[PDB]
């Protein structure tokens, strides 16, 4: 009751938040890494059998930082020599281990510098991509049959994704999908031939005398995007002296009419597939449900099995059209779309009929379908208590849309308001991950009795050390604006006195479909600035924020950097009326979109602000990739929305920057928000007479996440605030 949550306690994470990760190999068993070994846990009674013993790790590279059990549980994979590429991409060497014989596979290993690998959903087949090309290893102690031969570095991608798909379209590296029984091997091919190249230097070690220059096929805004091809290989005719048999499923003519994106793939049955295409504006997606023709080996589409989704007010979905969840048979699917009142709910589609019938309705939004079975459907929404900042698990009955229950609302309705789940393979059990607003609580439950079964992680460890340390207190409330109520949060200091004027910090994200105001437990940087520095760090979800309705979210369409920036200036203004706020000491700071808003807020002529750190900001929307920027801002052509492209730049606000202080942090090796954006901000600031401060982080990505630089970025940022708060 005198120690504080010092900055070193965040940068060194002296307060651990233990977790509990498990993966379901069946419908009632799962694996878990207990004290370095892998136990075959059981869900029914809790009795745990040893799967793989520890100290078994040796002579297999320097380490072993991922494992993948073959679905038949005959074999297992070891992922070592990890090498981070972008966000989800990475290269690594892989080994296969016999579980029955308890040996290692020596004949025909997995090539060094692998890009991706996966078992089949059943059996122990092996598809993998090496040097931009797909391979198949039907058995592990045998040789592979190469599938694609067109893979070229930074040109052709076969089975993986170029940068822009991995980033804004796919949120993963892989472009492979094994069919249910493993007959077919669906995959995509990407041709970045005409995609222009961002070029940034990279300095590597102290040893190296001539910096590498990294080249990335990065399609910026309104520039030539890559091309997409989708294939379905038939792994039955794969012999050494036989042809690679395949078909090309294509978007229907409505999307094929121009440029397009493949934004989703769903295997339905062994002879039915679900592809989801979307146009380059992204206000039009369609689904093409395709049945395998046995005579011709085709995947024939049909107008009847084609469902359209458009948005007359912005983009389709949140960051992409929501994926569909098919029944076990396939004559219908449940997909999350927006209704007439502008609220994303679950609609039930007959597979061969146009119109859908909504099965959820309200002034709330459905987060995501988590599991589906013949009797019940499981989803997650922020309906409970009516607060969009929370998440709870729901179960609706198929035949009776009325009977809908909550599996997670009143479990520990003070410690547990942010919930996420992972079900068994047949939804016979589920792990309820409770994220906040208290200490996290990973609780396993049964589908039938809805009981505690066993508590997996209660984080009793954190409680003990954290009751001898003064800790802050989140204040989630609301303020009225534009005749509507938008949420806000304030991580207040300990021993809060509503009379002392307090310095303000405004942590900003304020992106399309964003959430700064949440019931999540996060030992944050602000958790220090409140506990040890006595600074109120707030957060506001104004126009642009999601999960609050399309009418709110789709308010920034074709005008990025306008409403979200002014809405965050109004919201701070209403905080400088409360008697506990030193309005002469208000700050703002941002990473990525935050850095944009922060800078556009500092350059608006507000008067509300005095200092402002901007880490890795976007300075001009034409400088960012095409998918993202065109989902919202549109096209930089003079016949689309260039006029607004030209007045959404922070460099256009440079004159109004000499009224404030500013800290431009950015990483020289940013493949997302390149150094370009921060650098041209400097140039116009310099060219205008604005005094500011900077700090380049050499060889650091969009996270500046190497250990000694993550410490530095917050050590160099605290000083700025402290000296701006005269602290």
């Amino acid at each position: 009751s005198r120690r504080t949550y010092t900055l070193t306690d965040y940068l060194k994470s002296t307060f651990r938040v233990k977790f509990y990760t498990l993966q379901w190999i069946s419908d009632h068993e799962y694996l878990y890494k207990q004290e370095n070994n892998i136990l075959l846990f059981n869900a029914e009674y809790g009795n745990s059998s040893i799967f793989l013993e520890n100290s078994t790790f040796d002579e297999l590279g320097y380490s072993t930082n991922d494992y993948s059990v073959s679905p038949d549980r005959q074999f297992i994979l070891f992922e070592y020599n990890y090498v981070k590429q972008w966000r989800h991409s990475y290269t690594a060497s892989y080994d296969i281990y016999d579980l029955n014989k308890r040996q290692l596979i020596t004949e025909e290993r997995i090539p060094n510098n692998t890009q991706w690998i996966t078992w089949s959903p059943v059996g122990h087949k092996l598809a993998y991509v090496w040097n931009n090309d797909i391979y198949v290893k039907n058995e592990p102690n045998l040789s592979s049959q190469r599938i694609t031969w067109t893979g070229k570095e930074n040109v052709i991608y076969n089975g993986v994704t170029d940068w822009v798909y991995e980033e804004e379209v796919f949120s993963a590296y892989s472009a492979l999908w094994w069919s249910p029984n493993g007959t077919f091997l669906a995959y995509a091919q990407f041709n970045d031939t005409e995609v222009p190249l961002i070029e940034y230097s990279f300095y590597s070690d102290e040893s190296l005398q001539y910096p590498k220059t990294v080249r990335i096929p990065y399609p910026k805004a309104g520039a030539e995007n890559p091309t997409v091809k989708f294939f379905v290989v038939d792994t039955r005719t794969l012999s050494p002296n036989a042809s690679v048999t395949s078909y090309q499923i294509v978007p229907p003519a409505s999307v094929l009419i121009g440029d397009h994106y493949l934004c989703g793939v769903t295997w339905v049955t062994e002879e039915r597939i679900s592809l989801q295409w979307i146009r380059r504006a992204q206000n039009y997606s369609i689904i093409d449900i395709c049945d395998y023709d046995e005579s011709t080996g085709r995947w024939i589409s049909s107008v009847a099995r084609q469902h359209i989704e458009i948005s007359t007010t912005g983009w389709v979905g949140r960051f992409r059209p929501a994926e569909p969840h098919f029944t076990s048979d396939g004559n219908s699917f449940y997909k999350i779309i927006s209704n007439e009142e502008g609220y994303k709910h679950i609609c039930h589609f007959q597979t061969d009929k146009s119109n859908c019938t909504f099965i959820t309705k309200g002034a709330w939004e459905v987060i995501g379908i988590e599991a589906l079975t013949s009797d019940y459907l499981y989803y997650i929404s922020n309906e409970h208590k009516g607060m969009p900042g929370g998440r709870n698990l729901y179960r609706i009955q198929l035949n009776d849309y009325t009977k809908v229950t909550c599996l997670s609302c009143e479990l520990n309705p003070e410690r547990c308001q942010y919930y996420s789940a992972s079900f068994s393979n047949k939804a016979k059990y589920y792990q309820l991950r409770c994220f906040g607003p208290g200490l996290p609580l990973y609780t396993l439950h049964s589908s039938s009795s809805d009981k505690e079964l066993r508590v997996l992680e209660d984080n009793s460890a954190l409680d003990k050390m954290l009751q001898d340390v003064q800790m802050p207190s989140k204040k989630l409330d609301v303020i009225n604006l534009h005749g509507t109520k938008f949420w806000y949060q304030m991580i207040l200091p300990p021993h809060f006195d509503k009379s002392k004027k307090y310095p303000l910090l405004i942590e900003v994200y304020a992106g399309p479909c964003s959430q700064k105001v949440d019931t999540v437990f996060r030992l944050s940087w602000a958790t220090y600035l409140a506990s040890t520095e006595n600074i109120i760090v707030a957060s506001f979800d104004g126009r642009g924020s999601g999960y609050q309705g399309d009418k709110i979210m789709h308010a920034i369409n074709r005008r990025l950097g306008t409403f979200e920036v002014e809405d965050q200036i109004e919201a701070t203004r209403q905080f400088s009326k409360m008697g506990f706020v030193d309005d002469k000491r208000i700050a703002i700071w941002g990473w990525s979109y935050g850095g944009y808003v922060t800078s556009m807020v500092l350059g608006a002529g507000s008067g509300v602000f005095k200092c402002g750190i901007a880490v890795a900001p976007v300075s001009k929307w034409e400088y960012y990739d095409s998918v993202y920027t065109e989902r919202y801002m549109g096209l930089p052509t003079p016949e689309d929305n260039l006029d607004y492209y030209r007045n959404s730049t922070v460099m256009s606000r440079a004159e109004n920057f000499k009224q404030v202080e500013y800290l431009l942090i950015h990483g020289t090796a940013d493949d997302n928000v390149h150094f370009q954006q921060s650098a041209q901000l400097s140039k116009a600031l310099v060219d205008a007479g604005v005094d500011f401060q900077t700090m380049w982080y050499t060889d650091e990505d969009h996270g500046i996440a190497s250990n000694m630089a993550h410490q530095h970025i917050y050590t160099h940022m605290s000083h700025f605030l402290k000296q701006c708060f005269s602290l």
Partner: peptide, 7 residues
């Protein structure tokens, strides 16, 4: 697009 929000 946000960091890896490890706060």
């Amino acid at each position: 697009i946000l960091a890896p929000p490890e706060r």
